[PDB]
Amino acid sequence: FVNQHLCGSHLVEALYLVCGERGFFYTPKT
Amino acid sequence: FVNQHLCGSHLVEALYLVCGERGFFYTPKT
Amino acid sequence: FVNQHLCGSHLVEALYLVCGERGFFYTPKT
Amino acid sequence: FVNQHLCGSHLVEALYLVCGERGFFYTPKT
Amino acid sequence: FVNQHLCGSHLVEALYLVCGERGFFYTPKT
């Protein structure tokens, strides 16, 4: 796999691809 | 705002839009 | 809802989520 | 260019690509 | 058609819209 540069909704898309229907937590700060 | 079918990556995109900075959990095994 | 920072196709995605199958007009300038 | 099925958010993405600066209307109740 | 300003995954989306199920090659450099 290549390293990832992901901002905003593109990170959320990547999380879905990695985790799928297992699910995931999107946990940014302030 | 309307009621529509949001599934898969479209549902997580909708969560990001609504929650954003706050974060969210996508747990479809619940 | 959180405030939105949306450019290009991401705004169009947000419009679809808000309006759905009611439909919408995407009306930028020049 | 090919003929394919464009539905929902994918259809509005295709409209943005083709029309962009000009703008567009997505009116599926027509 | 309008001219396109497309980076990262947005270009890949445009390639899919143009080529469809014919398929395409995504060929960047280094």
Next chain:
Amino acid sequence: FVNQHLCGSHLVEALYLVCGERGFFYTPKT
């Protein structure tokens, strides 16, 4: 990483994520 159904533009998005700089080929007529 999970096994899930990736189709159409979602599949090419997944290819971009995994391959990125390397590039990829999407040839569904194979």
Next chain:
Amino acid sequence: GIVEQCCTSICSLYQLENYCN
């Protein structure tokens, strides 16, 4: 869960606020 409320059934953006952290 969320899949049943929003994907199988339909839901608004208000209902999506329920799954914010």
Next chain:
Amino acid sequence: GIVEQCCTSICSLYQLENYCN
């Protein structure tokens, strides 16, 4: 409408130009 031409039936990018403003 657009759903019938492009989602139910199929359409090209040329047909999508019809819905530009």
Next chain:
Amino acid sequence: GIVEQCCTSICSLYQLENYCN
């Protein structure tokens, strides 16, 4: 307008409702 405000500064989902049918 709305398109430029959302990108240059910020906008709300309630402002986007104005552009629905």
Next chain:
Amino acid sequence: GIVEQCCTSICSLYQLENYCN
């Protein structure tokens, strides 16, 4: 091909590496 492995059947990100250039 890729459609059969990943769209019709299911596949992981490891299997998607096969289609990198």
Next chain:
Amino acid sequence: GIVEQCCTSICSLYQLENYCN
């Protein structure tokens, strides 16, 4: 090439046709 031109400057949909099968 094409990938860099589309992002750094602009490209057309007709230029993108060159990379289809």
Next chain:
Amino acid sequence: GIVEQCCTSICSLYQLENYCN
């Protein structure tokens, strides 16, 4: 954290696995 690292610098898909259920 992870969200900021992926955007400001880079992250790997293996780092993203940590946030799955």
